[PDB]
Amino acid sequence: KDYDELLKYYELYETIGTGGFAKVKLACHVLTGEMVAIKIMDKNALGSDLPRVKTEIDALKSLRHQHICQLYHVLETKNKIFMVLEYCPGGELFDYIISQDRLSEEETRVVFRQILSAVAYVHSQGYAHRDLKPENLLFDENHKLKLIDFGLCAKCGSLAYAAPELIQGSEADVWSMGILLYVLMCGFLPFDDDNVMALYKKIMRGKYEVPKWLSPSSILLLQQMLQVDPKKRISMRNLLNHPWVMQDYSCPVEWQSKTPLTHLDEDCVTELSVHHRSSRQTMEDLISSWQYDHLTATYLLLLAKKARLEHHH
Ligand SMILES: Nc1ncnc2c1ncn2[C@@H]1O[C@H](COP(=O)(O)OP(=O)(O)NP(=O)(O)O)[C@@H](O)[C@H]1O
């Protein structure tokens, strides 16, 4: 039905996750054999919340980056919206933290630099994420982080990660990254309560426990990021070459995209052109329209496949 058009292009596997808006299914793009994750949303059930989806969709169409979960295909039927995404099988950063209880400062730095790369890129494109937290960061096959859930992108979110100025746009993401840092290094939240009023007061207050295993450097960074006054809160740029961030690193954080679509891959175009019964020139013209239809998705998945193969060649 709504699924019949989808099943032209994908064969559906099991549900692998859910959220407040979407049921997420593993699937396989038939033409290329590539696995993907499909967000399924019901328009009728979403109702007045639907703009969030069109928000996420328009955001993701203009974001392309190593640490951003890629959007391949958008499909609307009478009752459903389907978003076909890069499959990340490593699960959430959340579950990883719980598995390790807490991360070492060193592995925290490795993770944090990737988060920072993604968020700095997102800002470079004029957005703020507004829902940064370990649940919205997924591990891919190579244990690399991929940011998801862009429905709150603005050109808001879980309270424990929400900045003070926002519960009464760049500075906010910085705050949330501070909370995330704390969580990675500590295994728990700095501001936590079952009572929302209590939690709120704790946040506006800005006082948190500082455990013995933490380095002075990281303690400082935290206090720079968890400044209740956004005016006093550290800026993205200064986060990008902050000494804690740069510790044991001769490289500043490369937030710039490593995956821009500069120009069309010949092999991929060729492969598409055969299946499409059109010349390569024609296919080039078509692909450049970037409609996020089946053509777009096939092209990008062929590209991802090729990259994966080139990594083992
Ligand atoms: N690309 C993906 N690869 C693997 N698992 C995914 C992927 N996208 C989502 N998931 C899983 O599905 C869950 C729900 O995704 P999510 O995008 O947060 O749903 P949502 O309803 O649209 N947003 P939210 O209600 O705020 O969580 C995630 O927490 C993951 O467990």
Numbering used by the authors: 2 to 156, 169 to 181, 187 to 331
Sentences reproduced from the published study:
Murine protein serine/threonine kinase 38 (MPK38) is the murine orthologue of human maternal embryonic leucine-zipper kinase (MELK), which belongs to the SNF1/AMPK family. MPK38 consecutively comprises a kinase domain (KD), a ubiquitin-associated (UBA) domain, a TP dipeptide-rich domain and a kinase-associated 1 (KA1) domain. Activation of MPK38 requires the extended sequence (ExS) containing the ubiquitin-associated (UBA) linker and UBA domain and phosphorylation of the activation loop. MELK is considered to be a promising drug target for anticancer therapy because overexpression and hyperactivation of MELK is correlated with several human cancers.
However, the activation mechanism of MPK38 is unknown. This paper reports the crystal structure of MPK38 (T167E), which mimics a phosphorylated state of the activation loop, in complex with AMP-PNP. In MPK38, Thr167 is substituted by Glu to mimic the phosphorylated state of the activation loop. The overall structure of MPK38 (T167E) shows the KD and ExS, which contain the UBA linker and the UBA domain. The KD of MPK38 (T167E) adopts the classical bilobar protein kinase fold, which consists of an N-terminal lobe (N-lobe; residues 1–91) and a C-terminal lobe (C-lobe; residues 94–263). The AMP-PNP, which is an analogue of ATP, is positioned in the ATP-binding pocket. The UBA domain of MPK38 is a small globular domain that contains three short helices (α1–α3) and binds to the back of the N-lobe. In MPK38, Thr277 and Leu279 of the UBA linker modulate the αC helix from the ‘out’ to the ‘in’ position via a strong van der Waals interaction with Arg65 of the αC helix and an additional hydrogen bond in the vicinity; in detail, the O atom of the hydroxyl group of Thr277 interacts with the Cγ and N∊ atoms of Arg65 at distances of 3.4 and 3.6 Å, respectively. Additionally, the phosphorylation-mimic mutation in the activation loop triggered reorganization of the activation loop and the interlobar cleft into a more closed conformation. The activation loop in our MPK38 structure is partially stabilized because the glutamate does not completely mimic a phosphorylated state and the interactions with the surrounding residues (such as Arg131 of the catalytic loop) are not stable.
